[PDB]
Amino acid sequence: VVALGLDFGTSGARAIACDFDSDRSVSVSVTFPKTSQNWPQVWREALWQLLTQIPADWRSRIERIAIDGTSGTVLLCDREGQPQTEPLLYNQACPIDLADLADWVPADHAALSSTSSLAKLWFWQQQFGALPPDWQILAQADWLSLQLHGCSQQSDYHNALKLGYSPDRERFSKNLLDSELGALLPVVHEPGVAIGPILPAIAQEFGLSPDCQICAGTTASIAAFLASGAHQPGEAVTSLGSTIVLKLLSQVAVSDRLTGVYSHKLGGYWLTGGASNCGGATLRQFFPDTELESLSCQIDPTKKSGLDYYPLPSRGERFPIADPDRLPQLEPRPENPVQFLQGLLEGLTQVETLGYQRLQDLGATPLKRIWTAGGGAKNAVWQQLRQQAIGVPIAIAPNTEAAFGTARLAAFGLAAFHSA
Structure with a gap:
């Protein structure tokens, strides 16, 4: 099997096209600016650059692709995946009371931080007042993979954890789903499983196989562990x-x-x-x-x-x-x-x-x-x-x-x- 791994870190992004039959591999990199007023565009361009730097004979044999992003970085988009406001990053904390989230997660959940995705979603909720049900909240890996398969509101239970997802019971709490934030929550899959086929236009543009599969991603901290085997x-x-x-x-x-x-x-x-x-x-x-x-x-x-x-x-x-x-x-x-x-x-x-x-x-x-x-x-x-x-x-x-x-x-x- 020939798979492509995409890592999106804090200061840059690295792609590794690995070929497990031989075994042989090729690695490429891009480095982000330290400042920008349009980070999603930077990430997107980084994605296309990463794909571009990979040799053609490699791209023509890639079968499966996966993407890991920084845990905590989130975007608020409409039904088509277009950022309505500028992202809240992994380091940024929110000036909200965590007691507001008490009815949506267990009293020990990792989403009970001022940096968690749930907290950021609540913050956005009390900036905009009332978030449209049409919209969606997406992790970095979710959005970047969305650029590849086009299926909206899709995620893994690695990035969804700090959004309030309960991996123990494979669900969000019923209170959270019944709330005004429930409509924006994504469908959670297992990391590794195939979300859907790559977009035809994308495959044509980058000389990729139209039968290529885009899998559910994960976080960088976990992907690093997965590298050990x-x-x-x-x-x-x-x-x-x-x-x-x-x-x-x-x-x-x-x-x-x-x-x-x-x-x-x-x-x-x-x-x-x-x-x-x-x-x-x-x-x-x-x-x-x-x-x-x-x-x-x-x-x-x-x-x-x-x-x-x-x-x-x-x-x-x-x-x-x-x-x-x-x-x-x-x-x-x-x-x-x-x-x-x-x-x-x-x-x-x-x-x-x-x-x-x-x-x-x-x-x-x-x-x-x-x-x-x-x-x-x-x-x-x-x-x-x-x-x-x-x-x-x-x-x-x-x-x-x-x-x-x-x-x-x-x-x-x-x-x-x-x-x-």
Whole structure:
């Protein structure tokens, strides 16, 4: 099978045409401006550019296409999919009372944030006063795929989660559907399934096969996990980027609203996770990547440093333990930079450890393996500390690109996430 994965990030977009029969692949990229007063147009043009940069002999063999977008970015469009107002982005919060959403979701739902799609929809509702039933609200991936198949009000239960969708019971609440917001909600499918055939004009214009299928998309955070290929409960992906992001595959959904922990549905399994403010950003505050490696090469992990740090970049922690007043603990400081770096890495290691432990304490499936992603993944000393502190096999993930995971999503769907 030859599938195309489309990843739409925060600062740009990457496309990966992957060909799983050989295996061979080709990747292309576009970078967004940092400012614009017409983001949908930018996204659309980015889509066409991505399609254009892909070689013809590749486009003529693409069978299935999938699109992942940023979780939280939404658009308000009419019945034809034309943006009526300018999008509300993933980072933008809304000045509304969450108590207004209490009757539409359980009292622990992930949609109960000031950044969630439901909150943004309520905000738009109290700007416009009364949103027409003719209209629709669409996630970025929803809209971008709408550019490909033309079927309106279609979505997956990854992006719909923060819109108020209940993946546990495969539905929206009856109160939400009975409300004045119910008409704008999309039909929710499973990520990977084929929504419909590609538009004939589009296929003609880009030399694509008219029998090509556009599948239901997902989020970038999940597509990144899908790139690893982990499908057994207990398997986890740890992202050692600027901030440490933990993702654990479990047989049971967990949730802790205080720490921002919630679970996505993934086939017959669940994908839980968390995000700490600690990470590689704290490391580059004291060392450039220049000195970082040259100092890490002098660290023997099999002996403790005697240091006990909590490597926060600034005031406030979110996960595993939530306290918005916790100061960074980076004392005492030995003059030997090696042991200081070791202390930092030990701190981060403890962050990851306590994270996974808390995830297990919330009811998630016991940890079995670790697949590491991010810049810190190639750090073998850090890997040693991590394995010493956790006690499970840790290795570098074969792939980390979200577009590739989206390609695997288009080609195979969420089939592997069952036990049959």
